[PDB]
Write a protein that binds this ligand. Structure first.
Ligand SMILES: [Cl-]
Ligand SMILES: [Cl-]
Ligand code: NA
Lengths: 121, 125
């Protein structure tokens, strides 16, 4: 009545996984709920518009994307990625929490070395 | 030079799991980095002492804890729990990101029905 079956979460996982693998950010943005909450480093973003703006900014600095692993846990889709920015490689973890077929919350873990870089972006 | 092995992460996972199941928050607080960042709903907390305060507030209202499932993903420990508050059961997911043997960041997913309740507890508990 308000939750998502494993099958439903898996469908969104496949979409997210495919989008990351193709380096296709627009598919992921379309999966965000209008009031999506994004947490990355000290920064926090509210709303799909703010999230889309942030995603586009980040992707402009990213020269290469590699998907290391993807896992589903309850209504959470976790994606471990490596981004190349200016010849340097950074590992990040994206967690997508799904409600009603869309992503309500995004938690992004970034390494301390990327924190300095991420402030610029 | 800066990472944690799967074995070290799993050790902390076991500690976190035991603390939840046995209902002993001080064990969790002891694993938090001094500058731990916690996000739950609209609330945000910085520092272990502040996180400790939030944990104590919550535990005042939580009458039962059930650890439904636990998984390790890279340096993230995810714990799915059910909390009982005032006779009602809520499902939550706690994600603990580990750095250098302690938890640097905590991300908590809560269902929309719990959102109002959690704001009361964390602000006014
Ligand atoms: Cl449901
Ligand atoms: Cl290391
Ligand atoms: Na949410």
């Amino acid at each position: 009545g308000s939750h998502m079956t494993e099958e439903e979460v898996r469908k969104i996982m496949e979409k997210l996984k495919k989008a990351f693998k193709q380096g296709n950010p627009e598919q992921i943005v379309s999966l965000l709920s209008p009031d999506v909450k994004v947490d990355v480093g000290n920064q926090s973003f509210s709303g799909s518009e703010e999230a889309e703006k942030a995603a586009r900014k980040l992707m402009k600095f990213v020269d290469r994307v590699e998907v290391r692993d993807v896992r589903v846990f309850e209504n959470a889709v976790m994606i471990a990625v490596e981004f190349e920015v200016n010849g340097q490689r950074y590992k990040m973890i994206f967690t997508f929490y799904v409600e009603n077929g869309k992503v309500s919350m995004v938690s992004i873990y970034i390494s301390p070395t990327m924190k300095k870089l991420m402030k610029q972006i």
